[PDB]
Scaffold this active site. Sequence first.
Site, short mmCIF file in Angstrom:
data_model
loop_
_atom_site.label_atom_id
_atom_site.label_comp_id
_atom_site.label_asym_id
_atom_site.label_seq_id
_atom_site.Cartn_x
_atom_site.Cartn_y
_atom_site.Cartn_z
N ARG A 54 7.78 4.97 6.97
CA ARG A 54 7.80 3.89 7.93
C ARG A 54 6.47 3.89 8.68
NH1 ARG A 54 13.23 2.63 11.62
NH2 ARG A 54 12.88 0.38 11.85
N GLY A 55 5.69 2.84 8.46
CA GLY A 55 4.40 2.64 9.11
C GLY A 55 4.50 1.87 10.41
N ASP A 70 -9.71 2.37 7.44
CA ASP A 70 -8.58 3.20 7.83
C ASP A 70 -8.51 4.44 6.94
OD1 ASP A 70 -6.53 4.03 9.58
OD2 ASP A 70 -4.99 2.72 8.68
#
Length: 325
Positions: A45-46, A154
């Site tokens: 889960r980001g 990122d």
Amino acid sequence: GPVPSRARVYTDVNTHRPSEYWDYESHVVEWGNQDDYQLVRKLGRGKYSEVFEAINITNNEKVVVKILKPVKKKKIKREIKILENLRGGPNIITLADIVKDPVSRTPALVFEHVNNTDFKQLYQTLTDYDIRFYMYEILKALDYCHSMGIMHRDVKPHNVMIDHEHRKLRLIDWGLAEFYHPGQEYNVRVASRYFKGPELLVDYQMYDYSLDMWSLGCMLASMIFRKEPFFHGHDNYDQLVRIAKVLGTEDLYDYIDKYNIELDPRFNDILGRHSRKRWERFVHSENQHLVSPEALDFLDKLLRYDHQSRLTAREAMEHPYFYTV
Ligand SMILES: CC(C)c1ccccc1-c1ccc(C[NH3+])cc1Cl
């Protein structure tokens, strides 16, 4: 005003291409069949995503489904176009399909499955050669996306999937990636705190591909010194102080003077005065097996305040640290 900057390499790759390549807002997204996928289990889960292991029922192939909270349509279009442009690149995660949930109107990206193992679990089996090997695999991916006029923005361990058994590496999560245009001023609220480069921290908008090389340097430092994260900031201002405690404050002030950067007033209250530390100072009995003069020289070139001084992905690939790969 601030002094303008240009990337040392791949400066005009997007200028010389048609608008279709980099104009993501004009990209037409076409949905696959969500019914071709059966969800197996939750993987993660980001920030704005839920990740599931799934199987493609049409060919019994295991895939990963990244269910996106459609908070910003433009951002989704950007990630899809970049993934499409980079599809088939060395060590770039393969986007296999794009699908939608018709009832709640939810987009989902479907990727090739990678049998990943976390940094903490991986470290114990990793040898000096293995770090050189995987670092080179990341560099092939970065030199490829930079050559394609894309900044990842990122780079971090959570965005690097590694199947050690098959010695397979994939650069993932392209949701913050952006096209590089010379002279363009970008949002500095990118990358994850520990991996943000000095340009992001001092609010220097005209950055480039070098930002990824700083993040890569942060990763290398945490591995060779087994200090995760290497620069442990508690907020974005504190992050620069943690960098200054290692790189020293002298080179920091030279960097802001060179680009005529207006340093935020807060910094006078927390920055202080710090000497430039020798990299050998971080070597201890627990981490010495992954340290060598070549490793420290390579890290020194990557971790520089001046984004233009930092090695490019192609230059990094020619460093003696990788003569064994
Ligand atoms: C060897 C490797 C390129 C590396 C170097 C420096 C810091 C961390 C890591 C790393 C990245 C991702 C993962 C799996 N998510 C695991 C590890 Cl060990």
